[PDB]
Amino acid sequence: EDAELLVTVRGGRLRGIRLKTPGGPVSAFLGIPFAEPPMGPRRFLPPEPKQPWSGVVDATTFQSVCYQYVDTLYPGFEGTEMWNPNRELSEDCLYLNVWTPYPRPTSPTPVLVWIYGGGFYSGASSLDVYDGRFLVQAERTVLVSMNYRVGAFGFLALPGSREAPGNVGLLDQRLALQWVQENVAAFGGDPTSVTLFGESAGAASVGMHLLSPPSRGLFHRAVLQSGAPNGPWATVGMGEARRRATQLAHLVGCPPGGTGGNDTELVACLRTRPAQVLVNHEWHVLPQESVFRFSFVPVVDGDFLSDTPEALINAGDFHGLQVLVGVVKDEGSYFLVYGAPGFSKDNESLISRAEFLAGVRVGVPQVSDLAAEAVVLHYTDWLHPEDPARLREALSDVVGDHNVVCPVAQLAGRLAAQGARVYAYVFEHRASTLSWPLWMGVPHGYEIEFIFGIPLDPSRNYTAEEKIFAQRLMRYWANFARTGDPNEPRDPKAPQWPPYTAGAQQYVSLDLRPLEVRRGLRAQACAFWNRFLPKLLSAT
Amino acid sequence: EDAELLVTVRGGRLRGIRLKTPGGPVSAFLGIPFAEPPMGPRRFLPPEPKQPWSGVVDATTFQSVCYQYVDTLYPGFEGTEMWNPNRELSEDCLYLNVWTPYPRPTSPTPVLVWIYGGGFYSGASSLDVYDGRFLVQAERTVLVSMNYRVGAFGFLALPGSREAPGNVGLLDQRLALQWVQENVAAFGGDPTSVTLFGESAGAASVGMHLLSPPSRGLFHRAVLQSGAPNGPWATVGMGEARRRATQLAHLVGCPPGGTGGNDTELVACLRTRPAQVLVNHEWHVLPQESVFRFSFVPVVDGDFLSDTPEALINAGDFHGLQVLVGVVKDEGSYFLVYGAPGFSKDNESLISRAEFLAGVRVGVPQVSDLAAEAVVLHYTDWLHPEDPARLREALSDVVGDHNVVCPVAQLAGRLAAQGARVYAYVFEHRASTLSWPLWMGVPHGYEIEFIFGIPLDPSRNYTAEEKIFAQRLMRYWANFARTGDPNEPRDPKAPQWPPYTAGAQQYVSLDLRPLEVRRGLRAQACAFWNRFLPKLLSAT
């Protein structure tokens, strides 16, 4: 046995596995338990720390995926199944992973902590696209990733009650961050230099930890990729969370007629149901036909979030914090084949104007007819109001701006203007191996494979420049993790990445070309979403 | 070396396998090719006979399942998974199976030919519930079952065209019947005594072979379980079939933008698409939200069916034919969890009056508001018009009578009154192992396991009484196959099963109790569907 595959943490001993890369080996510790299994009476409850164990826990393979819905929209399709669970489902899923360079660093090394996305209803740290061997080998940093409870198991909430307080999936992530503080030094990691990064719901999660005091002391930098905590999908109110939890109980026979009723009896009945039965009725609790909406998400209850993310962002002091935010070029195109009429991944989706007008109500659910008219006015090219291709791109912009780009731009502006040093990007390279149709462009979530250095995998068919592009991206993320600045600490040859300010609003485009500085993250469109539209609904 | 596992047919030599039962072995020949693989340019075309082969074809296991939609409404649930494919999907699927007793019969033995159901969009002869080893062992008959193309591959139709004539899945079954005529003697079977039996869409298939002259000479008796060719779901018009085929082509990008759209180019574009891509858009061509409706079904084009099944049934002479027909006690309950509002398999489905009114429009699609009113009138208990339990059972009766019971009763009456000997039954035993909820009663399709003697399987947990009940039913079906009469010829001690007549309308109840004679296949309700409702729609 290689000596560097044996590590002792506060809970006990572990045996890791050596992973191969074209540039050299790395040491990996996959499936480390950080919490007691949230099963039986522990369902819906906050996580408890993992009790110490005897012997050597095997950490050579990923553990189970938390119970979640499995996408069957396109059986056998690479574009969807790459996000589906690649391990067996189980409520015994609170395990984390650690990648560390070989040989192990002798001095403390900055730590990257990945939080996966998936609309808070799906996701796993074991997905092939989250493989941390290439990032750790090329940049010699320590990478951690954890599983957290999703769906009803992580975010079902009867606010006020203690049997189902909600946000327990966020508490799973926090416990994993406390675990990194107490044990990452055993792998050569620096607990004083922890950079969180996540995508979509993971980016929203990273934002929630910035706004939660108990979590803020567990890390020092943040990267939010195509997500923000102030998104219209990332949180729900206490009243709506209670309605969704009560409807899920009704769909699974809780409570039995006629018994009632209060929260203790409701959760007790829910804890007797098999986990798959809860998953099978998760989508049937959404209030209306929609895209980019999820049943069980973090709740604003006054505990984990003392106020709404919007309020905490405005009143927040962010001095001494560095943040890197960004979006992909086509944030909304992915979600249109999940409900927008006239859309299909297997044709050109050249929708009609009638389909566009109906799609706006699906992309912007429960807004007034007047608000929908305002959306149609802003996103219609009135010189070509019936052109199908322009309408297809317009509805993609509607969903992308409303859900991702403008919530991110709002956060980046308030962050920079209130003490934080902010860097912004727009990812504009479409992978040569992308299986989604061409009209989707650069869809939501398809910068991750380049951040993690997946093009370096010799068993895959990326181009030579995509490999160079991936290495340049890993350099950016690692430089930000080490120094808080994506630019090379001395290299003057490479073009510079200027910080994002609420006035200049500078950002860079990430593609095969060298860095290009641009201004305004869709400033005109986001002024409609962030400034005018909220006033349009106040006066109904 | 058992020589009985080696058989020569017109195409070549085969090697079978011995199957064990508690009562003795049987010889099975699974996966016999009866047609050329309908792949490439042969997609959507009628089948052609399998050309002779050299050597010994292995017939020891089931072959591939025809490409079809896979039910994922309840992952891991036995009630739905039991109908899903248990072999890999392939367009190379035209294979049949024959079970023969051991030792092989020395005198010609009557043949039972099974045609599976599945709404013409799914199904396979390899399903565990269609295991013919117990029926062949206990009753010493020859059992044959075949795969036929389902979905768009079997029933997509551009009527009048040569590239996609339609009904090719029915022609698959006919070719398998011609195969039985030419080869079943090699297994000890009597080609002059062939009894077709099938369930749901298989029963509708059996009925359409009754009404097609080229198929009528290939068999001598018929059993129609919970299905009929005159059902509102079993056939489709030429205009509607063309619209659904053109819509499917549009959803998969056919034809490409800028090219013509005649039938030759449309099918040519469809033949270049991967089979799974066609499956992924099958349900999106139905004209409206509904239950018990399927996209690609037999088409009335004047070829396989010279006229509508209703017309051919009325003007048909059925002298010299014996038919066994029947239904289960709760034909409609299964389909309510697939679209009816307020229904769920995991609760009691105690729907409201408003949900019942909306469910009638789903259960009876495209009827005038006046016609839906007539349905509500007949199926409302006006002394308890808001009782949820009664409304749940009423909507189940609406879907069951409209789609199964009354089409079957209409067929049984016309058959008996026009020369055929008809026997009718109602299956009223709910399996002790049934995984569907109690409120569904005896759902659609759950008499099959008793007809095939599945309770005899030692690895199952059926009761001792259900085993004797299964042996009773297998005797009924085999007696009908041998003599055209389910009653035992050497026997007046058991209760007799009287024939079904258009006047007396006698039938028997099949359950753990001895046979009980009843009169009327829901005569009052079926007079509404078969007599009054057509006149109501004529006057719009």
Ligand SMILES: O/N=C/c1cc[n+](C[n+]2ccc(/C=N/O)cc2)cc1
């Ligand atoms: O039996 N239930 C089927 C079913 C119910 C609800 N959906 C909705 N849905 C929306 C968005 C997504 C992913 N968005 O990124 C995934 C799934 C699909 C299938």
Ligand SMILES: O/N=C/c1cc[n+](C[n+]2ccc(/C=N/O)cc2)cc1
């Ligand atoms: O995301 N779309 C999911 C979805 C698409 C299409 N269907 C149609 N469908 C109807 C009837 C049956 C079985 N009937 O007995 C099975 C399946 C269901 C779900």
